[PDB]
DNA sequence: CATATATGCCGGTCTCACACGTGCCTGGAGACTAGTAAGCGCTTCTAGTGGCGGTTAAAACGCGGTAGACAGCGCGTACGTGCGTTTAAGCGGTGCTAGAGCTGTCTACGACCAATTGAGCGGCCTCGGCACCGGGATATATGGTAC
DNA sequence: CATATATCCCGGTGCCGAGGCCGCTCAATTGGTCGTAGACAGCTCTAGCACCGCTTAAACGCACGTACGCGCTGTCTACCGCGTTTTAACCGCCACTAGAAGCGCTTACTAGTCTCCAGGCACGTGTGAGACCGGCATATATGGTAC
């Protein structure tokens, strides 16, 4: 017989069959092709690839082995895209970017 | 006693940190923020296809609608590698039957 | 002795909590507050700690975005002072009224 | 069978200095002596409202301690999603 | 002509209007107002009584519900009084089994 | 034999529709019994509501029937339909006259 | 010849507009614009005349409100005359603008 | 020449009046055509998103309505 | 004061959209069955509460003085008015047909089922990352002074 | 130029949270069943589009000049920086138990099904609300000029 995941059938980290279910347990509509959570997950892994990435190198230039919440801040506030999706979303934790107004500065 | 089973994304988010960053580690409050991100985003594209396949009289959520999600709530550069990555593993998955 | 000019310590402070992530108001009064207004909400309410850094994480962090706003009002006015008027002006343009 | 302490005046623990530390996290270098009330104000009004939602929710869950998901959730409703507490 | 029929409060909000002003009537485009209304309050209450069910792992949407929905989503004297009209209107419903 | 649940609540608004509109648009798994006469209810109270004061607009206008602009003043005069409404814009409805202060002449 | 002080047409001009409920833009040019810009996303595309006249109600409420909080914005900063960076800062503050 | 100068001086007068504005700065015009531009972008974008998905080659009111609901800008009487 | 013109109003005149009566047709509402969600008992035990005293960092206060808020001036021109001229929007029109969108036939697909099994979880143990500390290297802001 | 005071960046130290081993066990995988959602194609005919040529109204551009933006200046005091004194946060520990969280029984509630029956619809009308509007009446802005 088989039992090999549908993550590995799509060649994807993200649970393939956790996502099947929550979309099924999760009232938005009656049926859920055999797709959808496929698609879903390798959009959820995609997103957490990208911020992760960005995210260590803040670790890094901090001289850090573990991304803490100000990494993931750092790195969410200065990309454009990433800092679009969560323009309305507080990180516990993350502080805000240095940012001084011009006419502050002293002359 | 042994305490209920709470489900958590951080095995798949530390399976991803290890392809992008082997050496790098990640705090419990970091995990958190994590986990946050995946629920939100999930119910946002969730939303999004649910409201698409009520609006053309659908009783089905497929990948299409999740593209056509994906489309509408993730900025230009973001949804263009997004729908091209999940687009991929729906070709993969289907001819993995 | 020695005496800082106005306006360079403030400069200082700047870049200080601007690095920093650390919660500005301390734990115990925000506590005890929160405690008061639920209580006038309903009597007899506990709450998990965690609820109490949650809200007070939320309200840290409205109040950082508002000040920011607040800022640019008063910068508009050609000021470098933050008064009542600019929270108020910042605060109808975001539609809290 | 014992007391609770009476809870008066507790805003004032939203002290000067906090609020200033605040405003500098901001980018404020000056801040007029009436800031201080007026920052009062409008933080007692962000937490009723806040607080009000997670009760309600707290109430609707037929509990008589509000969690964290309680406050996440009414945080979620107000347009102030936060990461990092659940959910 | 094979007719196509599509629904709308509209009968309804003349049987109201009737009660409340009984010698006044409605531009089409003001029941067009009056139909997004209703449409969207349906929508905004159901949408948290959804929320309420889930995160109290229970499967079904109750006037309890329906109930903390109006409380979280009207504002104060709009919301005492949808709760008065809402509780009655199940009461009598109950009472002519 | 056979009567609307509408009319065993008391209400115009109509209960059956709201319970298959409940059931049919992915809300839950199940639906109680009290839950469309509440909402129905809530709805109708909400309908009237707006309508007397829009109503009351037409009368102030000289107009025997409502226009979306009655809609409008009805709903920004109440300090509490104009929130509940707060992010929602009227169709031909205008904006109340409000000239601010120091723009009046001297 | 006669002539009103300058300010007096304008208070008018606001009194009538605030009274009306009437679109003010032309319905072409604005339905020129949107056919425009929509055949830069998918091409050989025909509009309902709805579709249409929700989308000036939509545009001439947002940019009246907008309007509103730059005139807002000019008078915070002691003045009668709304200038761009009066829209700015509106835009800023309600998030449209980072 | 091009479409977005048929929104002309006049009509944002108009329409800055109906937002009770006195006076207008001349830099305003073309200021308010490219904030008015990025307006009907955003929203236009969604409903043609939303025809692509019904897969049509009309944009309907709904299509509009649903992209403005999305948008933060719900519409009312169109067919919300 | 008087004079100009914008705006409001009346009463009449018309027109077309509203709101009415008439099917008709579907989408519900009275039974009725049958299975599960959840209410409500009882137990476990987590974590929320309140209390105390050693320490000390944060808050508070008063002082002194500077730099920013605010008001008053005065200059320059960007605007608002109104006019005469040009332009194109709107309109009522007569086609013309893309395509919205409905019906009717037929797979492919997704739910449901209910045994089988390894993915993911709660424990549990444990070092290596990092919080905190103090030493010595700069970097800057301000003050003393020579020119 | 000189000097004072913040902040950097360095190891060095010690704590405890991340992260990895385990063994238990549910939720996900298999693979077979069955009902229907939706894909596809034909057909209809709604409504979107387009070329036309009047007829105004609205846009345009121009030229006048005023009230407003704007930069300068001078006044004064509110707000910053800092020293000293006061206060209550924090920490680390108690001790106590409310109530959160979980389990097992048990049954009204609800969904799923048929049948029927009338509620809500598209249609078709004809008629009064209101849009227009001419010309009249009222309200208000603007200036003249002589106190
Ligand atoms: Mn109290
Ligand atoms: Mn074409
Ligand atoms: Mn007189
Ligand atoms: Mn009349
Ligand atoms: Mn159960
Ligand atoms: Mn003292
Ligand atoms: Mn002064
Ligand atoms: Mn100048
Ligand atoms: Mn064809
Ligand atoms: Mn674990
Ligand atoms: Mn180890
Ligand atoms: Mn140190
Ligand atoms: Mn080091
Ligand atoms: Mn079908
Ligand atoms: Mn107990
Ligand atoms: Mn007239
Ligand atoms: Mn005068």
Same mark, same amino acid.
């Given at each position: 017989?088989?039992?090999?995941?549908?993550?590995?059938?799509?060649?994807?980290?993200?649970?393939?069959?956790?996502?099947?279910?929550?979309?099924?347990?999760?009232?938005?509509?009656?049926?859920?092709?055999?797709?959808?959570?496929?698609?879903?997950?390798?959009?959820?892994?995609?997103?957490?690839?990208?911020?992760?990435?960005?995210?260590?190198?803040?670790?890094?230039?901090?001289?850090?082995?573990?991304?803490?919440?100000?990494?993931?801040?750092?790195?969410?506030?200065?990309?454009?895209?990433?800092?679009?999706?969560?323009?309305?979303?507080?990180?516990?934790?993350?502080?805000?970017?240095?940012?001084?107004?011009?006419?502050?500065?002293?002359? | 006693?042994?305490?209920?089973?709470?489900?958590?994304?951080?095995?798949?988010?530390?399976?991803?940190?290890?392809?992008?960053?082997?050496?790098?580690?990640?705090?419990?409050?970091?995990?958190?923020?994590?986990?946050?991100?995946?629920?939100?985003?999930?119910?946002?594209?969730?939303?999004?296809?649910?409201?698409?396949?009520?609006?053309?009289?659908?009783?089905?959520?497929?990948?299409?609608?999740?593209?056509?999600?994906?489309?509408?709530?993730?900025?230009?550069?973001?949804?263009?590698?997004?729908?091209?990555?999940?687009?991929?593993?729906?070709?993969?998955?289907?001819?993995?039957? | 002795?020695? @005496?800082?000019? !106005?306006?360079?310590?403030?400069? &200082? =402070? +700047?870049?200080?909590?601007? #690095?920093?992530?650390?919660?500005?108001? @301390?734990?115990? !009064?925000?506590?005890?507050?929160? &405690? =008061? +207004?639920?209580?006038?909400? #309903?009597?007899?309410?506990?709450?998990?700690?965690?609820?109490?850094?949650?809200?007070?994480?939320?309200?840290?962090?409205?109040?950082?975005?508002?000040?920011?706003?607040?800022?640019?009002?008063?910068?508009?006015?050609?000021?470098?002072?933050?008064?009542?008027?600019?929270?108020?002006?910042?605060?109808?343009?975001?539609?809290?009224? | 069978?014992?007391?609770?302490?009476?809870?008066?005046?507790?805003?004032?623990?939203?002290?000067?200095?906090?609020?200033?530390?605040?405003?500098?996290?901001?980018?404020?270098?000056?801040?007029?002596?009436?800031?201080?009330?007026?920052?009062?104000?409008?933080?007692?009004?962000?937490?009723?409202?806040?607080?009000?939602?997670?009760?309600?929710?707290?109430?609707?869950?037929?509990?008589?301690?509000?969690?964290?998901?309680?406050?996440?959730?009414?945080?979620?409703?107000?347009?102030?999603?936060?990461?990092?507490?659940?959910?």
């Amino acid at each position: 017989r088989k039992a090999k995941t549908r993550s590995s059938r799509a060649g994807l980290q993200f649970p393939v069959g956790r996502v099947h279910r929550l979309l099924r347990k999760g009232n938005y509509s009656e049926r859920v092709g055999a797709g959808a959570p496929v698609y879903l997950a390798a959009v959820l892994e995609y997103l957490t690839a990208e911020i992760l990435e960005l995210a260590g190198n803040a670790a890094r230039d901090n001289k850090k082995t573990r991304i803490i919440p100000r990494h993931l801040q750092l790195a969410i506030r200065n990309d454009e895209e990433l800092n679009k999706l969560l323009g309305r979303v507080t990180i516990a934790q993350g502080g805000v970017l240095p940012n001084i107004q011009a006419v502050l500065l002293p002359k | 006693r042994k305490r209920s089973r709470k489900e958590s994304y951080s095995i798949y988010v530390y399976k991803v940190l290890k392809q992008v960053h082997p050496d790098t580690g990640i705090s419990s409050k970091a995990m958190g923020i994590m986990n946050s991100f995946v629920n939100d985003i999930f119910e946002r594209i969730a939303g999004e296809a649910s409201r698409l396949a009520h609006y053309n009289k659908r009783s089905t959520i497929t990948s299409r609608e999740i593209q056509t999600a994906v489309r509408l709530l993730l900025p230009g550069e973001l949804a263009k590698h997004a729908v091209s990555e999940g687009t991929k593993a729906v070709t993969k998955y289907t001819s993995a039957k | 002795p020695h @005496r800082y000019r !106005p306006g360079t310590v403030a400069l &200082r =402070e +700047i870049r200080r909590y601007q #690095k920093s992530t650390e919660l500005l108001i @301390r734990k115990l !009064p925000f506590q005890r507050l929160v &405690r =008061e +207004i639920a209580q006038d909400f #309903k009597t007899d309410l506990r709450f998990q700690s965690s609820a109490v850094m949650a809200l007070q994480e939320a309200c840290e962090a409205y109040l950082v975005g508002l000040f920011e706003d607040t800022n640019l009002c008063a910068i508009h006015a050609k000021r470098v002072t933050i008064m009542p008027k600019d929270i108020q002006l910042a605060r109808r343009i975001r539609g809290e009224r | 069978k014992r007391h609770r302490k009476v809870l008066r005046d507790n805003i004032q623990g939203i002290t000067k200095p906090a609020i200033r530390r605040l405003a500098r996290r901001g980018g404020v270098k000056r801040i007029s002596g009436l800031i201080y009330e007026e920052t009062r104000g409008v933080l007692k009004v962000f937490l009723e409202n806040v607080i009000r939602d997670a009760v309600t929710y707290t109430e609707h869950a037929k509990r008589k301690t509000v969690t964290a998901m309680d406050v996440v959730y009414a945080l979620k409703r107000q347009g102030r999603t936060l990461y990092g507490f659940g959910g």
